[PDB]
Structures are given as C-alpha cells and as structure tokens.
Amino acid sequence: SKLKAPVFTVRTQGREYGEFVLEPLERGFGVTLGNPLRRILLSSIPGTAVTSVYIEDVLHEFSTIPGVKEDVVEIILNLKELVVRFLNPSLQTVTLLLKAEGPKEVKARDFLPVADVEIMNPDLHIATLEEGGRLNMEVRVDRGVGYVPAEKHGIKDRINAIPVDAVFSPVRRVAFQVEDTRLGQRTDLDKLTLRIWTDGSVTPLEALNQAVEILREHLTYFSNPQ
Amino acid sequence: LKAPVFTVRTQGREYGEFVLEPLERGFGVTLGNPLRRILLSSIPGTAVTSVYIEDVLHEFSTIPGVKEDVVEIILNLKELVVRFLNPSLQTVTLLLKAEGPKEVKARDFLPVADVEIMNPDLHIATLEEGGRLNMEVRVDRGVGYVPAEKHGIKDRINAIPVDAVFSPVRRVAFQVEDTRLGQRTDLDKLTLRIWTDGSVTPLEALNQAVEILREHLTYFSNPQ
Amino acid sequence: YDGRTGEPIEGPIVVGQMFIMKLYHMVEDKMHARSTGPYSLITQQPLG
Amino acid sequence: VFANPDEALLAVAHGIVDLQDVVTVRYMGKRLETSPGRILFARIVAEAVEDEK
Amino acid sequence: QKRKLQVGDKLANRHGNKGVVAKILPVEDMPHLPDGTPVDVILNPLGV
Ligand SMILES: [Mg+2]
C-alpha cells in the first residue's frame, strides 16, 4: 500500500518571489527534503558580485570626499546592491567605468555600457553630487557562489583599491514550512511549503530547479567503490 | 571541485563504513542527514506477526511444563531475525515441535526453502520433563512499525497478533572531518556508519536509501 | 546533534540516565462524554 | 558593515557572525549599530502586523 | 487489557518532578549522541 505520487503546485508573482507546495508526503519527509534544499539554495547557486572599487583621490575606506553628500562607506554599501548579469558563458570578470560631474544624481545607468553585460536595476541610486563635485570610479565584478568577506579574498587590482564583501548568491532568503495533512484513514502525512526570495537575476523557479539538480548529481557519487 | 572518491569498508553482514571525500564546505551535513533519516525509517525488512500455540487460548496464560508464560515467549519471538532469499516471497510460516527437558533455541525451527535464520542461538523457552511446545510462527515482509491492533492478523481462531518492527537497520551515525585539496582548506570528508541485523547488509541498505531520495527528487518536475 | 537538521545544538546539553515511573492516573480511565442519559427522580436533573 | 538585514542574516547562515555580535547594519535609511538578532526581532514584528513603519 | 504508553499518561521521578506525555516522536527526530544513540525523554530545564 505505497503512497500515491504527490502534486506540485506553484504560486509565483513577478521575478523575485514564489511559493511552492508539495503534498501529500510520508511522515517525516517534509523535513527530509526541506533542509537540504534550503542549505543548497543559500550557498551553491552561481551569481555575480562586486569585489573591488577604485575611486580617484580616495585613500582609505573610512574617509570622505569633498563635493559629494555620501561618504566612502555609503557608496560601497550601494555598490553591494547592484545586480548585473553576464550574457557570455565564457565571460569571467569585467570592469565598469563611471565619470560624473555635479550637481547631478549618479545612477546605475550612468555606467558605461559593456557588451554581453546587462544591468538588472538601472534605477539604483549611487551618489549625489553638488557644484564642483568629481567622481572617477572603477568597479570590478566577478563570478562566484555564496558569501565571501572582503578580508578573505582581499582582491586589489591596482594601488589604493578597496576590496568589498562579495554577495554572490542571487537568493536573498529561504523559508520552508511543514504541516500535518490527512488522506482518508492516514493522518500522519506531510505537506511542504517552500518560499524563496531572489534579486531578479534568476527567477525563484529557476533557483529551485538548479538546487534539485545539484543534489541529484551528488547522489551519483555513491556508485563506484574504490 | 573534482568528483569525490568512494570507499567501502565492511565487517561481516552487520557493519560497514562508507567514505566520500573531498566535498565542498557544508555538504557533509547536506548529504549525511537525509540519508540517516531515510535509513532509520524507510528500509523494508521482515518481522514476526502472529503466533499460534496448541492448547493456548490467549497470551495471559501459562503452559504446563514450561518455565515462561506466553507474554515472555512472545517477547523472545520479537528478537528473531529471518532472511528471505527470494525477493518475490511475502510470507512464510515456521513450525516447531519440542518435548522436554531441553532449552529450545531458534535453530529448532524446521528448515524451509529460501528462508534462513540469522540468530540460531536465540533462547525461546525452557522445557521441563513432561512439557510440550507445538507452535506456528508467521513471518511477514513490510516496512515501519505496525502495532498488533492495526493489522490484527490471525491465521486461525486462537492465534495471537504480534506488534511488528520491520526495520532491519539498528543504528546510523555519520562523521564530518576537515580535509584539504591544495590551496582550498575548508573542505569536508564524510563517513557513514551503519549497523544492521544481518538480513540486509549495510551496503544494500545504503543503495536502497539513495534510490528513495532520488525518486522523491522527481516530484519537483511538473508544476500543476 | 539535532535529528531534524543534523546540526549541533549551540550549547552543550546535560545528558544522563534517570529512573522514571508510570503512575496510576491514565487518560484512558478519565475521558467521558454525554449527550443525553439518565435523570434524577425528584429534581429530574441529569445524574453525576 | 551590512547594506540591509538580508545581507546580515545571510552572513549568519554562513557562520561569519553570531546573532549576539554587535555590528553595523543599514535599515530604514539609518546606519544602526546593533546585533543581527535584534534586527531579526524587528522583522518579526514588521511582518506580523504587515506595516514596517 | 495490555496498556502501552500514550499521550495523556502521567510520569514522575522520585524527586517530585511529574508531567503528562504530550508528544511521541519517531526515532530520527530525537536528539542523538555523536555515535548515533538517540535519547529517550526530553525534560524542560525551567521546572528545576
Ligand atoms: Mg526486526
């Protein structure tokens, strides 16, 4: 009397949030499946991030620039919010150039275009300039997974460059829920809900499909002993 | 990271160690825990389900010439380990006939084709001179833990249903060590330790658990 | 270790062996319900 | 120094910091100096009443 | 009748700690030692 195959339903709004439901399951299988997928979603999905920044006439990370409202920390904090997608599978790392003159507001769309490189949030605010303000900045973007602090990689292309924390993972947050359900005379069944937040570079449904394939590939390693 | 190497170390039909290395940081728990949860709950085995003893009406009675009562005898029958050699076999009945004085062990059951007893030295009852024991034991195949009240299996009028513990897996643990590969230093080394009763080998149980997890991963395929 | 996740509890836990008894008061002997039933002679109220 | 509550809590999942360590987090347009666990408590209330402000 | 432990039954030790059984968990859900041995009973430290 094996259980019938469960039903997989989806409820996705936009490109940044989705809910996924799978029921019915055997007792204890909601925890068996929810935890491994949650761990994979937060550490293994490929992505892109900013790893270093060079600003003209700037010495260290805790200083301030004359002619701009923001300090060095706030500019760096805004760079960590930038979402960029590579259109070339062979492309590994690119550099972005920015030149601005006051008193305008610097946006993400003010970066010079690069082929096979796309900005996903061009309306992101960078800095505010005033009369007599200068900003000469160079941003280096890499590929990777997970979360790597600046002091770990410590990447500096040139002299007086500031490494930044690399938020590689496109997934922003994962939360799963397990509820008791029933099917006739069976009362200890499981219903699993999976909720995913993403930055839009990959759809939440895309991230789930990649996480399942990573787990399936690791299961084929129990094949050839010695 | 390059594909890990798989290593197997086995001690008889009851213990085994399985090693997979090197893995990425955190993947030892990601792989180890789901396998342990499946191994302890979802592996099929066999169990004693119903017993009939001649001249016995229920389990709250005694037998002349026998030291133990029916409750104690049934508690001894829950420790019997039976291995089916045919995958198509679902149920068998074992017969025992004894006259005292003697200590009757599990090896006193009559031989049956495609059936093997894994603990022949299991004590069952003590017979004094003048005592007799004539019983039939039914062994089924199943999964999980099923109380006698749920199945209520009786082959005849005076049979006594028995609670079934079908799982052949006794104990599971996994270890995570700190390995390295060249410059990379935060890699994982995973070891699985499995204890079984002998009717299923630890390597057989590991293969069946991996298939259960792989089968469940196909349920995420068609969004309805 | 946590059986649901496989991760350790964040602090060491006191673990040991203890002697525990099962008491005479069981829920099997105490659950009761009624819709209608016997009534009293004089007051015609339900019995207790 | 974290740019938002999501980044600070992602660092906790990777074991970089604990929920009791005092750090710098940007939240609701202000540069706060708190722990990730106090930021986590604020999100519990905000989502329960469905009004961040 | 033969009675097994169930939710609603009362347990106690010799030092005056008592309580009713509220939950029965499968073995893979219980906390366990690094060698794989799971515990039998979980007691709240707030009663001490
Ligand atoms: Mg057994």
B106 and B71 in a single domain? The answer is: yes
CA end-to-end distance (rounded Å), chain E: 36
| Overall number of domains in chain B | 2
A212 with B210: Cβ contact below 8 A: no
**Buried b / exposed e across B150-169, counting CB within 10 Å, b at 16+?**
ebebeeeeebbbbbbebbbb
Task: Please name the residues in contact with A11: beta carbons below 8 A apart, sequence gap of 6 or more.
Answer: A18, A19, A20, A21
Q: Cα separations (Å) of B201 from B12, B17, D31?
A: 8, 12, 59
Q: Which of A168, A194, A209 is the last residue of a domain?
A: A168
Task: Please name the residues in contact with B59: beta carbons below 8 A apart, sequence gap of 6 or more.
Answer: B70, B71, B74, B160
B150 and B60 in a single domain? The answer is: yes
D21 reaches A (C-beta below 8 A): no
Domain with A182, as residue range(s), is 3-46+169-222
CA end-to-end distance (rounded Å), chain B: 36
B172 and B162 in a single domain? The answer is: no
For the CA atoms of chain E, what is the radius of gyration? Answer: 13
A23 and A85 in a single domain? The answer is: no
| Gap between the Cα atoms of B52 and B77, Å rounded | 12
B58 and B161 in a single domain? The answer is: yes
D14 reaches A (C-beta below 8 A): yes
CB pairs under 8 A between A and C: 5
Q: In chain A, which residues are followed by a C-to-N distance beyond 2.5 Å, i.e. a gap?
A: none
A143 and A85 in a single domain? The answer is: yes
Residue C29 burial by CB count (10 A; 0-12/13-18/19+): exposed, middle or buried? exposed
Q: Which of A124, A142, A168 is the last residue of a domain?
A: A168
Cis peptide before A149 (omega within 30 of 0): no
B144 and B173 in a single domain? The answer is: no
A125 and A15 in a single domain? The answer is: no
| Gap between the Cα atoms of A31 and A146, Å rounded | 23
Give A113-166 as a DSSP string: P-TTEEES-TT-EEEEB-TT-EEEEEEEEEEE-SEE-HHHH---SSTT-EE--E
What's the CATH code of the domain at A177?
A: 3.30.1360.10
Chain B nearest-CA residue for A215 = B31
A27 reaches E (C-beta below 8 A): yes
A124 reaches C (C-beta below 8 A): no
Contact predicate A190/A30, CB 8 Å: yes
B128 and B205 in a single domain? The answer is: no
Chain E positions touching C12 (Cβ under 8 A) are none
Find the largest Cα–Cα distance for chain C. Answer: 68
Q: Which of A149, A168, A187 is the last residue of a domain?
A: A168
A61 and A153 in a single domain? The answer is: yes
H or E segment at A175? strand A171-183
A127 and A112 in a single domain? The answer is: yes
Question: Shortest Cα distance from A75 to chain B (angstroms)?
Answer: 32
What is the whole-number distance in angstroms between the Cα of residue E39 and the centre of ligand 1?
A: 20
What's the CATH code of the domain at A103?
A: 2.170.120.12
What is the whole-number distance in angstroms between the Cα of residue B142 and the centre of ligand 1?
A: 10
| Gap between the Cα atoms of B204 and B201, Å rounded | 5
A146 with D14: Cβ contact below 8 A: yes
E19 reaches C (C-beta below 8 A): no
| Gap between the Cα atoms of B135 and B46, Å rounded | 19
Side chain identity at residue A9, one-letter code: T
Q: Cα separations (Å) of D20 from A31, A147, D3, D36?
A: 27, 20, 18, 7
| Gap between the Cα atoms of B81 and B205, Å rounded | 16
| Gap between the Cα atoms of B131 and B100, Å rounded | 5
- Counting as contact any 3 or more CB pairs under 8 A, the partners of E are A, B, C
E31 reaches A (C-beta below 8 A): no
Chain E positions touching B37 (Cβ under 8 A) are 28
- Counting as contact any 3 or more CB pairs under 8 A, the partners of A are B, C, D, E
What is the whole-number distance in angstroms between the Cα of residue A137 and the centre of ligand 1?
A: 70
Contact predicate A5/B220, CB 8 Å: no
Chain E nearest-CA residue for C7 = E31
Closest CB to E28 among B40, B173, B193: B40
Hey, which bits of E1-48 come out as E strands? 10-12, 18-20
A120 and A185 in a single domain? The answer is: no
Q: Is A29 helix (H, G, I), strand (E, B) or coil?
A: helix
Contact predicate B179/B22, CB 8 Å: yes
Side chain identity at residue A105, one-letter code: E
What is the whole-number distance in angstroms between the Cα of residue B80 and the centre of ligand 1?
A: 7
Side chain identity at residue A127, one-letter code: A
